[PDB]
Amino acid sequence: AQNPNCNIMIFHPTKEEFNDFDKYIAYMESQGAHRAGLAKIIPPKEWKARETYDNISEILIATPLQQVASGRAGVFTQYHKKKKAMTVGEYRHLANSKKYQTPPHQNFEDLERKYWKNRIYNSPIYGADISGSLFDENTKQWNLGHLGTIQDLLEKECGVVIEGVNTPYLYFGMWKTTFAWHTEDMDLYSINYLHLGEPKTWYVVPPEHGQRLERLARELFPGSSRGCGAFLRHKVALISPTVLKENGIPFNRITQEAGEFMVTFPYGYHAGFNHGFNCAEAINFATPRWIDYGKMASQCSCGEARVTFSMDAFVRILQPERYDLWKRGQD
Ligand SMILES: O=C(O)CNC(=O)C(=O)O
Ligand SMILES: [Mg+2]
Ligand code: NI
Ligand SMILES: [Zn+2]
């Protein structure tokens, strides 16, 4: 078995190997990359996502989210308070203000220590979940707006044509902005490209050990667990690496820098934080190997998780027994 310790693997494809996206994902999996739940892909030196980022300031962040924490430094939840709209140029100036800017630090490890010590005492503002793309239309390789759609993959594997579309999302971050512990909708893959700015640190649990993380979460968030049998779908819970280590939960960590891709694999729980002002683009995708994970994915039916239009068909076809209850949650 390849990669039996479930380490995060880093890949350096050549420009020739960067042509065929599906084939390269399959290659990474042949080397055991999926066992980690997360892989890094460094593009060939010939490749670029677009020519420059000099003209992005007028993009609108319609609903910036202030991420307010509750709990203790290593075990907390966050809620999202909606703020007034602002442009990317306004948000960058805010990120760089004395109130929000990254503190002085020695290296990524020192900054990680400061994040876990101090995150709860601040409320950073995240420009998350903005439909759109920063890839140039002429970028032919690993263009996250030109991938094969999940609806087409389901149709190719299973023969059933379904409604829905699959488009990318932009994330504008600042110091301490946080993504809570989660797997993707319907335990899909994700791919994330860090277009510009400061790094993003990731934590990940191997898919084979995801249920260990879920059992810890039920212990640590006992009211949330009584409320919902899949409350990590709410995407609000944070647990620090120190707490994971104290409870014996297998996990790994890695820092993504500008110009790098990350791929998350089906049922790979992940969480993390931004180091300073940045912009990432991400989208979900599927392969043949995903189908069995989609059929088994947990679902929130309490009403909190509320998701996209296109998830309806995935539940309806892959999980017909659950469909009625899940849809009640959505309505
Ligand atoms: O970048 C973020 O805030 C969160 N991203 C992801 O969870 C992802 O790409 O799967
Ligand atoms: Mg602009
Ligand atoms: Ni994710
Ligand atoms: Zn729920």
UniProtKB/Swiss-Prot annotation:
One GO term describing the cellular component: nucleoplasm
Metal-binding among keywords: yes
Keyword Ubl conjugation among record annotations: yes
Binding locations of 2-oxoglutarate: 126, 192, 200, 235
Positions bound to Zn(2+): 228, 234, 300, 302
Compartments where located: Nucleus
GO biological process, any: double-strand break repair via homologous recombination
Entry binding sites for Fe cation: 182, 184, 270
Record note on cofactor: Binds 1 Fe(2+) ion per subunit.
Domain named JmjC: residues: 136-302
Domain of life: Eukaryota
UniProtKB keywords: ADP-ribosylation, Chromatin regulator, Dioxygenase, Iron, Metal-binding, Nucleus, Oxidoreductase, Transcription, Transcription regulation, Ubl conjugation, Zinc
EC number: 1.14.11.66
Listed cofactors: Fe(2+)
GO molecular function, one term: histone H3K9me2/H3K9me3 demethylase activity
Reactions it catalyzes: N(6),N(6),N(6)-trimethyl-L-lysyl(9)-[histone H3] + 2 2-oxoglutarate + 2 O2 = N(6)-methyl-L-lysyl(9)-[histone H3] + 2 formaldehyde + 2 succinate + 2 CO2
Residues of the JmjN domain: 8-50
Residues recorded with modification PolyADP-ribosyl glutamic acid: 16-17
UniProt PTM: Ubiquitinated via 'Lys-63'-linked ubiquitin chains. Deubiquitinated by USP14 with the help of TRIM14 leading to stabilization.
Principal subcellular localization: nucleus
Class of enzymatic activity (EC top level): oxidoreductase
Family: Belongs to the JHDM3 histone demethylase family.
Role description: Histone demethylase that specifically demethylates 'Lys-9' of histone H3, thereby playing a central role in histone code. Does not demethylate histone H3 'Lys-4', H3 'Lys-27', H3 'Lys-36' nor H4 'Lys-20'. Demethylates both di- and trimethylated H3 'Lys-9' residue, while it has no activity on monomethylated residues. Demethylation of Lys residue generates formaldehyde and succinate.
Protein name listed in UniProt: Lysine-specific demethylase 4D
Underlying gene: KDM4D
Parent-protein residues present: 11 to 341 of 523
